[model samples]
Target: STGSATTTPIDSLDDAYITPVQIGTPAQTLNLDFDTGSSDLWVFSSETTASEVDGQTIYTPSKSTTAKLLSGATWSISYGDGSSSSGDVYTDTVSVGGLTVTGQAVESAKKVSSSFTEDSTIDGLLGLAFSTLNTVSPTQQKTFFDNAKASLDSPVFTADLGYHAPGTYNFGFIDTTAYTGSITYTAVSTKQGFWEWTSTGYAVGSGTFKSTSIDGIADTGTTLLYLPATVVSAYWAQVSGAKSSSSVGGYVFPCSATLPSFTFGVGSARIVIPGDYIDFGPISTGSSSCFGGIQSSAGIGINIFGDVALKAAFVVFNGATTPTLGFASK
Candidate 1:
């Protein structure tokens, strides 16, 4: 059978896509961020410190008759942004969209960083990466998709992310009407536990395309585009008032500056990111300073094409025999 689900943007920031997921016997629903960068389905639960559970909803396993505690099993994860979460494990029925999997590992967070604690909207994260990346110790865990794939009509999921607009995430089936033109397919390397792909090269605006090989991950959890220092510098140089701002933490420019489009090479397809999308938004309310969506991936070691960049195209995370990425213009 096939299952499909609609995903909504948390807010105007277009930070991440929140999808509804049902867990346990009685089916307690929670809004979760479907993250492609990491693999761990963790939620704020009874184990979480009361101080750490602010405005988000917490999942209580005791209320479910089907919930089972996995003895000596625990999971801990930390992101590139320094945010982290750790917790115990439970085996329960979990459902996303219309697909349900029995005995799926659900990480009940006992601790969470302020970044997640402060986010009043998202209750947890549903990792979409391969199961090998799961942080659970003693016994590794499988993702919802991983557990449900054998039963799905087709083992594929598509991410249709939009800018300040509602989008949809389809599982087990693809909606041909959601995108335009052809979806250019490319082989992906999953050795690093991510949907990592190499771009033939990239060009700033309408500038000459460099044949430099750029390896990066398509991360929906991330908000901005992170490229190499040299690539970031080259793109910022095209903007008249662009500069690296220490206070803002990344590159910034005058809001009125006319920025140029960025293009990434993938096989014969050129995914062009519009100039307006690169402006990000104002640094603060009523401020002329705007943060550049593209920043340096220096310390992070690898570039990340976040929502700002992914929203410009419709992406398909094909997990058949080997993982492959298919991109189409929106």
Candidate 2:
């Protein structure tokens, strides 16, 4: 997602890094998750001790004169990966892209698991997806865009992710010139944490999403690409002697085998998932092989087509330009 003024890619930590906005006046940098799935800006709060915040980002209340604490208020967020966290609430002056948003709301986690324990490092997660999935219900709902929209340069927002860059994911601005081209828009469904779409798989070496009726949601917050059971079953059909690796609870094909190049058709745009993504490491535990770009998360309500799925196409959340977000080919 390159911006007219600046560009931010939505890649892994090695790819680019999103701006960790300042929380409160004195400025405690808040590294947020530019997730296109969930909504809300969640971070560790002043209540959290320095020990829990090791390696993770931290935010202090004393920094902001206007900072407010949602005393006695409780918040919790659960993910498909079985990752969950619960905490109290806090409000402060949060900044992103050098922009300061006063009275910005955030969650101050009290009890977190090893998975979310790392959240203490940066400030919190900045939800970039639709509003329906917001963790904050009617009373406490607040998103990063909710504040960003107030003063964005163009009333528009963009995501620029550079996979394998020095940082994880980089964001900030978008290049509107790229949007000069025509685009087909699909209205986002009001489902919770779900934005759906159909896709044609990638071409690894010489394979592609030919003869496949693959449809699912694209989620940035998730780390792995979760394909349907039937899709995984069918994908296993292609690999030479592919079999399920009970070790990882998924199918695996030989590393030497060539995978297919797939594309997702969103309106008129076709997004390509990289071939190397097909190289699922040796079952992550112990197995002869593992499923490529496609992994198994069959029962999960949100069939996330994670970062591995959206790398090819450049996605733009044009809240700054228009009311909703815009997707395009980079």
Candidate 3:
């Protein structure tokens, strides 16, 4: 009826959240990226090209008696960074925490991007986005959450992302102990296959809240918080040596410079993103210039409230008939 799993940050920068999931017969465990930004449960597999395979633990479907290949089914997905993976589909038992979903679609990669191979910590991705975004051709498969929704006590899951520590992903029920105060509920659009929502306004540091609303997607897959140029410019102006650098690929500032906290409203509830969260990391080891956690979304055409923003608060993804989002302070 309910379940919970812990997600550990693989890198010091908290680049990705990796959670272990039991897949197939006898429960072969693999560390997977829990991405709320996409809708495919794809993984590195024995079927992958040898050259593309690094140290990632491959899912050998042949060894799992319960695994059944979906004839003629295939999927391919690319990212803004040019990372991509393509593979065929298999339906098998996938258990996250204690909740088990039988007949879950698992994409076994035959090809993967070099960047993925380089990141040995991540074996695959388990998407939590809407099923409409599933990439399997001929017939799109329902996501694990979608398949488990009917049996769940509550058709909702919550993400508690940590700054440098392990976080938790709770399913079917919200752990009241994970957040402070009441959760701020707001309508979310499942259109375009994302947890898209609009904020009433924002505030820079302790300043007055801007009345303008901003539309953005809550994406756990993306590492940074991207906003409109106007808002981003306003934020950088407060830092002593902050500047947008083409070489650095976004705004960078002196590592020692003072930074202001950012606040965004979610259904009248204001959530603060601390200054420390914005100071992502140095552009280079021992470098005085450090990249910002918040950048311009102008290039991508839509604002993205990614992990940087998510690490600041507790977020809930409600999969009810009417999709909604909940945000609360820690």
Candidate 4:
């Protein structure tokens, strides 16, 4: 059985997208961020302290007849940006798009950091990473997709993140009408519990494509594209007034500076990120400088092909044998 869902950008901001999901017998609806970087279907719920909750929606397991607590089980997760949440576990009937999975693990938050609590619109996260990355204690848990995979016509999903617009997360089967050109496929290494791949190289503008062989993760939860410091510096160097600033948190350049297109190698196909996508936003309203959407992955240990880069192309998180990533121009 094939299924699909539409994803909408949050708060008029294209930084992250959310999809609706239902949990329990009566089906408590919640908006969740489908994150490929992490594993754990965690949600803000009645277990959370009043002070820790904001305008975000909360899941009340008690109201769901199908919800059952997993005795002695708990889970916690910390993100790269330092945001975190920890909670207890429950097994419930969970549904996404039109697909349903029984006995799916649903983690309900008991404690949440200020970063997560303050994001009033983000109800929780639905991890799409490999089940091996699950954080549940005692026994690990399977993701929604994993539990539902057997019923799916095909074990795959597509991420079509648009440029400041709405997109769809197609499941079970590929939608040939969603992309324009032939989808180029490359092998993915998931030993680290991530959709990791090695890019042949990259280039600035129409320059020669260098064979740098950068290993990176395709992270939908992250906002910026992170690369080696040297690679970031090379791109910024082309912009006349760009400079690295600790206070600004990354490279900043004059808003009027001409930026060059960035191209990444995937097998023999090249995915290009337009220059406009590099200017994340202004440092401050009316400020002449803007913070770059691309940054140094120095301390992060690995490069990240975050939303900034992923939004530039149509991506297929193909979960077939050997697990491959298919990229095509939007």
In model 4, the runs with Cα more than 4 Å from the true position are: none
Report how far off residue 227 is in candidate 1 (Å): 1.0
| Window of ten residues with lowest summed lDDT in model 3 | 75-84
**Model 2 lowest lDDT segment of ten:** 1-10
- Give candidate 2's error at residue 41 in angstroms: 1.5
Candidate 3, residue 210: Cα displacement in angstroms equals: 0.8
Q: Point to the candidate with the largest TM-score.
A: 3
* Prediction 2 TM-score vs. true: 0.78
**Number of clashing pairs per prediction, in order:** 0, 52, 0, 0
Per-residue alpha-carbon lDDT of model 3 for 63-127, expressed as tens digits? 99899999999999987668999999999999999999999999999999999999999999999
Which has the better TM-score: candidate 2, or candidate 4? 4
True-structure Cα RMSD, model 1: 1.3
> How do the residues 32-126 of candidate 2 rate in per-residue lDDT, one tens digit apiece?
66666777677776666555666666666767786787666667787666766667667777666556667766777665666656443334567
The best candidate in terms of lDDT? 3
Compared with the true structure, the alpha-carbon lDDT of candidate 4 equals 0.89
- Candidate 3: how large is its RMSD? 0.9
What is each predicted model's overall lDDT from 0 to 1? 0.89, 0.59, 0.93, 0.89
lDDT of 4 by residue, 192-300 (tens): 9999998888999888888878999999999889999999988888889899999988899998887898899988889999998787767888888888888999989
What is the Cα-based lDDT of residue 73 in candidate 3? Answer: 96
